[PDB]
Enzyme design. Structure first.
Site, PDB file in Angstrom:
ATOM      1  CG  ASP A 162     -29.434  24.281-131.945  1.00 33.79           C
ATOM      2  OD1 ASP A 162     -30.667  24.226-132.273  1.00 33.79           O
ATOM      3  OD2 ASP A 162     -29.026  24.833-130.909  1.00 33.79           O
ATOM      4  CG  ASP A 171     -34.869  24.436-132.312  1.00 31.69           C
ATOM      5  OD1 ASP A 171     -33.744  24.055-132.705  1.00 31.69           O
ATOM      6  OD2 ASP A 171     -35.109  24.729-131.113  1.00 31.69           O
TER       7      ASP A 171
HETATM    8  C1  LIG Z   1     -33.040  17.195-130.761  1.00 28.92           C
HETATM    9  O1  LIG Z   1     -32.066  18.138-130.267  1.00 28.92           O
HETATM   10  C2  LIG Z   1     -31.770  18.111-128.930  1.00 28.92           C
HETATM   11  C3  LIG Z   1     -32.243  17.162-128.026  1.00 28.92           C
HETATM   12  C4  LIG Z   1     -31.973  17.321-126.676  1.00 28.92           C
HETATM   13  C5  LIG Z   1     -31.251  18.419-126.229  1.00 28.92           C
HETATM   14  C6  LIG Z   1     -30.771  19.381-127.125  1.00 28.92           C
HETATM   15  C7  LIG Z   1     -30.061  20.594-126.646  1.00 28.92           C
HETATM   16  C8  LIG Z   1     -29.260  20.554-125.502  1.00 28.92           C
HETATM   17  C9  LIG Z   1     -28.656  21.700-125.016  1.00 28.92           C
HETATM   18  C10 LIG Z   1     -28.844  22.908-125.662  1.00 28.92           C
HETATM   19  C11 LIG Z   1     -29.641  22.988-126.800  1.00 28.92           C
HETATM   20  C12 LIG Z   1     -29.862  24.377-127.428  1.00 28.92           C
HETATM   21  C13 LIG Z   1     -28.515  25.125-127.663  1.00 28.92           C
HETATM   22  C14 LIG Z   1     -30.681  25.246-126.432  1.00 28.92           C
HETATM   23  C15 LIG Z   1     -32.166  24.928-126.487  1.00 28.92           C
HETATM   24  O2  LIG Z   1     -32.826  24.922-125.463  1.00 28.92           O
HETATM   25  N1  LIG Z   1     -32.726  24.600-127.702  1.00 28.92           N
HETATM   26  C16 LIG Z   1     -34.171  24.361-127.765  1.00 28.92           C
HETATM   27  C17 LIG Z   1     -31.855  24.481-128.874  1.00 28.92           C
HETATM   28  N2  LIG Z   1     -32.393  24.480-130.100  1.00 28.92           N
HETATM   29  N3  LIG Z   1     -30.514  24.369-128.776  1.00 28.92           N
HETATM   30  C18 LIG Z   1     -30.240  21.825-127.300  1.00 28.92           C
HETATM   31  C19 LIG Z   1     -31.032  19.203-128.489  1.00 28.92           C
END
Ligand SMILES: COc1cccc(-c2cccc([C@]3(C)CC(=O)N(C)C(N)=N3)c2)c1
Ligand SMILES: COc1cccc(-c2cccc([C@]3(C)CC(=O)N(C)C(N)=N3)c2)c1
Lengths: 389, 390
Positions: free
Chosen positions: A36, A232
């Site tokens: 992430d 991101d």
């Molecule tokens: C392609 O990456 C993802 C696809 C679906 C869900 C998530 C995801 C799930 C839970 C939290 C995150 C988070 C920590 C919080 C958030 O809203 N974003 C946009 C992020 N970059 N990380 C991602 C990532």
């Protein structure tokens, strides 16, 4: 120029996230962790959850250290909450090192874990400024660079399959590579072009021009970066500021007008299906995002195909049709160049030189007629004015 | 006060249940029976048990009829087995009628009867859909309505004392009123506001918004009704779905942050005590539950005080301190508006009009600064979306 041990260390997909195997504690506890670039906490499931088949068990780790402090991370209708501590962490298909790192042990969550994602935690790769509860909680990558000789850079090759992967396929398929401390030349073709990291918090960048099939969207460039533009890996879609989104959808609709789609499609809610192999890629336009270059008054562009912005999804009937969701959506928090955009490119997060590199990915989906591209240079003036304050 | 014969016919408390006197058989056998809107069987002790000082003796009733069928009823904690039959049933401080009703004669039980509750059976007032063994076993209230001229409605005024009642006091104290076939105006103040009965099984309702001291809990409203929300006089606590409970407790902790309480308190396990008369009610927030109204896009709210959600309990050292347990807990079966919530209100179960009415109770516990409230209307959109669907 090659990091064989790290090539093909990712799994997953744009809709649910790309993850890497990590180990936490002594003896090592293996977990799958979301890569992430849009957050800065290393946070792992640490209590039973219906969507988790494993979690971090602090009481079983001899190297666990309790920081005696909570951390609460709320979203709009959802959250994660946990308890801070430190432990020894390794990346089996990463650098051959072990780091003492901050870990947020997730004890409660709401709409955070995803059923079938196969990941149990998140690896926040962005900067300390956006770490929770505050900037004193050193992010994982900062600890990794401080404690080892690993160069201050990582690169991501996210590989979209171009078709839906079922439960078993997604667990068996290689989803890409995270090269820690370097650049692997086998993951890309052509030249790498760099855009400055505007400020070290999110991986912030500046978009200076937008085109749909070469037609300039013609908005004040500040609109494209209102209130910021970030790269991101933890966001599925290309997300655009309200005004930009409305203009972009109008232009994409105009270019693809030979076929009419319901409003629910353009809202990214409903799928569109075509008979197997007949997706009319050619009716959809390419999208070009021009990014500020490293040289004064110079930009470069990255070009995305509908094979990137149309996300493959399985039909409700599990038919032989090829189905997709529109992976461009509205934002109230600036532009987000998410996973569907990153799948077209090899992306170098050059923290040491405060810049992000883009090159055509060796695994991007395309057709016989068009390819994604990274090209330049272009003369562009007053690019600093495109940044929002 | 149109129903004097039924006013003050209940006894009991939130921790052990509110009960009404009934008679079964010929000659009549008197038993104390739990008033339970959360179940649909009329079931009575019919064999010796350590916690019963009386039970139904079928062999002494000339009007007893054996249905030659067994029934097995397990709960989360506790269970019972019985033998089905019918007999003549009356409610001495009730309508002046006698009805032939189904009775499950309890022959065996485990962790069901409560020591010192003073009740020997249960009156399941909900619908046939949830009756055991199946929906063909007509519930008591259905029999009552079919066999008499009693209107298809009942109302409950559960009266929490606001302090602990010892064994002697709880037997001598008036615990409230069950008005069969009507609404008694002396039991409430202000207006009655109605929420639809969503489906006739449990007394199911829809919560559309939750506030802690006026601050919106801000959850997707479906969360509040996941997988259902019911009004249950046979549950002690306000029970909330896991995610709702976690959000509500965080907010209640934040509002009451001037005093720190141990984790055991928030788990509803351990009591908290203050010197006699010094309970800091004002530090605890009021809780508002908005319910779907009878008019399109309109809701109303019921507001409860810590005098409702803090349940009075006697101290371990029977000291002169005023002690309480936190009476909000988590659920994996949806929201349950239990006795501690019902103690704030006069609750009308208007089966005839498929709606539940709430009004401020004439017996709710409060202080000089705050009172429970029932207020409206509020503009609320897409309320149908707050309901859960499997
Ligand atoms: C392609 O990456 C993802 C696809 C679906 C869900 C998530 C995801 C799930 C839970 C939290 C995150 C988070 C920590 C919080 C958030 O809203 N974003 C946009 C992020 N970059 N990380 C991602 C990532
Ligand atoms: C305030 O009402 C009560 C307080 C304590 C216990 C009970 C009670 C005891 C035994 C069975 C029931 C039951 C028949 C089954 C059950 O679990 N619930 C929640 C219910 N409504 N009735 C209640 C009621």
């Amino acid at each position: 120029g090659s990091f064989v041990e790290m090539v093909d260390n990712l799994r997953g997909k744009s809709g649910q996230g790309y993850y890497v195997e990590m180990t936490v504690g002594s003896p090592p506890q293996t977990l799958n962790i979301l890569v992430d670039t849009g957050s800065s906490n290393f946070a792992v499931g640490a209590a039973p959850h219906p969507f988790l088949h494993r979690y971090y068990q602090r009481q079983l780790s001899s190297t666990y250290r309790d920081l005696r402090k909570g951390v609460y991370v709320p979203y709009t209708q959802g959250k994660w909450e946990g308890e801070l501590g430190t432990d020894l962490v390794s990346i089996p298909h990463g650098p051959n090192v072990t780091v003492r790192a901050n870990i947020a042990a997730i004890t409660e969550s709401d709409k955070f874990f995803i059923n079938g994602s196969n990941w149990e935690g998140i690896l926040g790769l962005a900067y300390a400024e956006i770490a929770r509860p505050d900037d004193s909680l050193e992010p994982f990558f900062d600890s990794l660079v401080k404690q080892t000789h690993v160069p201050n850079l990582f690169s991501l090759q996210l590989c979209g399959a171009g078709f839906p992967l079922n439960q078993s396929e997604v667990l068996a398929s290689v989803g890409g590579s995270m090269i820690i401390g370097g650049i692997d030349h086998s993951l890309y073709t052509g030249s790498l072009w760099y855009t400055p990291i505007r400020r070290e918090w999110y991986y912030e960048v500046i978009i200076v021009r937008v085109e749909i099939n070469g037609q300039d969207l013609k908005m004040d460039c500040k609109e494209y970066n209102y209130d910021k533009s970030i790269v991101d890996s933890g966001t599925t879609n290309l997300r655009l500021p309200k005004k930009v989104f409305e203009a972009a959808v109008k232009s994409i609709k105009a270019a693809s007008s030979t076929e009419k789609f319901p409003d629910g499609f353009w809202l990214g809610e409903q799928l569109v299906c075509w008979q197997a192999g007949t997706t009319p890629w050619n009716i959809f336009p390419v999208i070009s995002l021009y990014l500020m270059g490293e040289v004064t008054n110079q930009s470069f562009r990255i070009t995305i195909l509908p094979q990137q912005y149309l996300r493959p999804v399985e039909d409700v009937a599990t038919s032989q049709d090829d189905c997709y969701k529109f992976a461009i959506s509205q934002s109230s928090t600036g532009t987000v160049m998410g996973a569907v955009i990153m799948e077209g490119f090899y992306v170098v997060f050059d923290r040491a030189r405060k810049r992000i590199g883009f090159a055509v990915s060796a695994c991007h989906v395309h057709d016989e007629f068009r390819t994604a591209a990274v090209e330049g240079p272009f003369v562009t003036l007053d690019m600093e004015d495109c940044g929002y304050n």
